[PDB]
Every structure is written in C-alpha cells, then in structure tokens.
C-alpha cells in the first residue's frame, strides 16, 4: 500500500518541501520494512484524506536518500518531522527534543490534532508549536 | 500481532502483481476500496455484493476477509482476557477492544 508517494530522491524531497507553502508538509523518514513504519503509514492513511486539504504528507526511505538521516540525524526507526515553507516547525512534545515524533502514534485523532496544532503554529509563525498533548509520558494506564 | 496490516499488504501486493500494467495505473485504488468495503461489510453483517467483479477477485477478497476476521476475533479475545486479568492498556486500546467486543 503506502498511498503517500515517497520522495525517492533527496533533492526531490527538498523541492517538495519548497513546493507547498500554504499547507503542512510532513515527511516520514521511517524505512518501509519495519513494522513501526508500517503502523506510521497506516496512521497517515487514516489521516490521508482528512488533513489533505490542510497538509501534504510524503513518505521517505532513509536507505534511498541517506542525506536526510545524516544531516538532520534522524536515527529513529520511524521519525515524523515537519517542514513548513523551508522552516522545520518544532512540536513541543516534551520528549527532550522537538525535531521528531519518534513514537508509533496509533491514535488517528491524536495525529489529526497534532497536525492541526502544527498548522496553527506555522500560521502564527511559532517555530516551537506547543503540542496539546502530554507526550512526555506514555499516556497509558 | 500485526496480522491485519500484513494481510492487507499481502493481498494488495498479490492483486497488483496479478493486475496488468494497463490496469495498475488507477484501478489499484479501486481494488483497495473494494477490499475495504468487503472488510467493513463482514464487520457489520452487511453482505458484500460486487457482481461486476471477477470471480477470482471475489474469491481472493473473501479469503482475505475471512483471514482478517479470524485475526480480529483472536485479537479481541486476547485483549478482553488481558483486560479482565488486569493488564496494562491505554485509552485507544481500550476503545478499540470495546468496539470489537
């Protein structure tokens, strides 16, 4: 499956980041073999036709284009990062850093809310968007 | 544990490899939608009737639906047993298990 077209070329991915400016660009640097990236792709497909009018999500393979995993240092098996009009917005997840999500978010509503908040912060220009979630914990009990 | 996504990917790959290049340009999404309709049909006791679809395609869709139903039933039973025992779950997992049950 993986209906989201993965930008094979690194320069193609960079141009795609420079392609759209009025919406949210999310790149899934996870390798499609691992099950975690499969769950991330499933979550994206859940929000594929929802956040489409406000965002443009693309997949990525760190093996295909390695420059993204060597310059941005995306060492996680499946890290979700955002870039808005040549500005990598930071989501205030609270996991020590804000460059990636790094978690296999199995909740479609949580992903949709995060996307909406990221879009609102990008519109407001805040480079560090306050994520409306307590991602610092496992959020399970 | 991930039988649903793996089975869907396998069925999609088999259908796409069987499908010709002349039909794999845009009808792959149609086949995926048909599989989704079959899945949602068996989960709500509503019959899935695609009389305009090939008989082997219908057989493959039915086999995939049966496999996914068996996997979902086993997963729901396991999750209900874990919840009754007192395992550590979350709100999303609890909601999904309650819906399946």
């Amino acid at each position: 499956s993986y209906m989201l077209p993965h930008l094979h070329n690194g320069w193609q991915v960079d141009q795609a980041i420079l392609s759209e400016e009025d919406r949210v660009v999310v790149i899934r640097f996870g390798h499609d073999w691992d099950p975690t990236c499969m769950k991330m792709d499933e979550v994206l497909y859940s929000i594929a036709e929802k956040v489409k009018n406000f965002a443009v999500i693309y997949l990525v393979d760190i093996t295909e284009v390695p420059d993204f995993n060597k310059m941005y240092e995306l060492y996680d098996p499946c890290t979700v990062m955002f870039f808005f009009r040549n500005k990598h917005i930071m989501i205030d997840l609270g996991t020590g850093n804000n460059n990636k999500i790094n978690w296999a978010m199995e909740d479609k509503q949580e992903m949709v809310d995060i996307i909406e908040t990221v879009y609102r912060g990008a519109r407001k220009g805040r480079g560090l968007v306050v994520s409306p979630k307590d991602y610092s914990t496992k959020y399970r009990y | 544990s991930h039988f649903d996504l793996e089975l869907r990917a396998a069925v999609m790959h088999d259908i796409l490899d069987m499908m010709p290049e002349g039909i794999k340009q845009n009808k792959a999404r149609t086949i995926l939608q048909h599989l989704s309709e079959a899945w949602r049909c068996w989960k709500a006791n509503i019959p899935w009737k695609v009389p305009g679809l090939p008989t082997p395609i219908e057989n493959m869709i039915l086999r995939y639906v049966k496999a996914k139903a068996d996997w979902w039933t086993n997963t729901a039973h396991y999750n209900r047993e874990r919840i009754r025992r007192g395992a550590t779950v979350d709100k999303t997992v609890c909601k999904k298990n309650l819906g399946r049950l």
Binding site: - | H13, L16, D17, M19
Partner: peptide
C-alpha cells in the same frame, strides 16, 4: 505507481 513500491516492500518482508 504504488504497485511497484508495494511489491518491493513485500519482497523484503
């Protein structure tokens, strides 16, 4: 289109 990528991913898993 997506068929080739899906087949490639399936063949490695």
């Amino acid at each position: 289109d997506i068929e080739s990528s899906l087949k490639q991913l399936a063949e490695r898993r």
